[PDB]
Amino acid sequence: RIIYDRKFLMECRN
Amino acid sequence: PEHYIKHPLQNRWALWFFKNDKSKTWQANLRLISKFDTVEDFWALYNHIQLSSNLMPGCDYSLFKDGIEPMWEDEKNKRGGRWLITLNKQQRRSDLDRFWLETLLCLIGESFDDYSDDVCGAVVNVRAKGDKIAIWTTECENREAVTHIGRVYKERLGLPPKIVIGYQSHADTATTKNRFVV
Ligand SMILES: C[n+]1cn([C@@H]2O[C@H](CNc3c(O)c(=O)c3=O)[C@@H](O)[C@H]2O)c2nc(N)[nH]c(=O)c21
């Protein structure tokens, strides 16, 4: 299972 | 390696758009927009579509796992409940756009621990008399699963302990009282 944090998902907006 | 690859998601997610039309059925008014299985393709699709607040009243965004359609009729959506968030008139400004985006990240990031396999999807209802955001599960009989999803769901959105969010099965919704509330 692949888990992504909220902090990490926000940084991929660019 | 790790320089050119897209960060892949656990599940493939399909985004749906619903627009009410009295001339046709409910299922025909729900239409699909795209599918994605990476973090990059999620932001690519989301950054060009409208915010939930800007939508015309009577329209729904629906993100679900690939294979589950946004309707009680689906196998996984049968039986399974709904963690319902009612929003008032003024909440349209900032709370609606922020709660729905926070809901999307809880789905695709699978932050619900082991109980992310029970999570079917989410839906936001842009309505003129209220706004509604919801998370759908695959079974309401799993109290161990349902309570843990809604409790993390409330902590991630950051609601005060004063507001209690309701969970209701689609068998009651299609015919209301809550089964579990946090
Ligand atoms: C998600 N959903 C809401 N409805 C109907 O919409 C009517 C009013 N509009 C809505 C609700 O109620 C919702 O939730 C929603 O959206 C209700 O009486 C529901 O019976 C539905 N009817 C079919 N056949 N299939 C659905 O998936 C469905």
Author numbering:
A (entry chain B): 51 to 64
B (entry chain A): 31 to 205, 211 to 217
Sentences from the paper on this structure:
Initially, the 40S ribosomal subunit associates with Met-tRNAi and a group of initiation factors, including eIF1, eIF1A, eIF2, eIF3, and eIF5 to form the 43S pre-initiation complex. This complex is then recruited to the 5′-end of capped mRNA by another complex of factors (known as eIF4F) consisting of eIF4E, eIF4G, and eIF4A. eIF4E is an indispensable element for cap-dependent translation initiation and plays a major role in recognition of the mRNA cap structure (m7GpppN, where N is any nucleotide). Under resting conditions, eIF4E is kept in an inactive form bound to 4E-binding proteins (4E-BPs); once the latter have been phosphorylated through the PI3K-AKT-mTOR signalling pathway, eIF4E is released and can associate with eIF4G to launch translation. eIF4E is overexpressed in numerous human tumours, and it contributes to transformation, tumourigenesis, and progression of cancers. eIF4E overexpression facilitates translation of weak and highly structured mRNAs that typically encode proteins involved in cancer pathology, such as proto-oncoproteins (e.g. cyclin D1, ornithine decarboxylase), angiogenesis factors (e.g. FGF-2, VEGF), and factors related to tumour invasiveness, such as MMP-9, due to the ability of eIF4E to stimulate eIF4A. All complex structures showed the characteristic cupped hand structure of eIF4E with the ligands occupying the cap-binding site.
Squaric acid possesses similar charge distribution, polarity, and acidic properties as phosphoric acid, hence the squaramide group could represent an isostere for the phosphate group. Despite low overall resolution, the eIF4E co-crystal structure with ligand 4a clearly shows that the squaramide moiety acts as a phosphate mimic by making a similar interaction with R157 despite an altered conformation. The positively charged N7-methyl guanine system forms the characteristic cation-π interaction as expected. Surprisingly, in the context of the squaramide phosphomimetic group, the expected enhancement of affinity upon replacing the N7-methyl group (4a) with a benzyl group (4b) was not observed. Crystal structures of sulfonamide 7a and squaramides 4a and 4f in complex with eIF4E were obtained and show similar binding modes to cap derivatives co-crystallised with eIF4E previously.
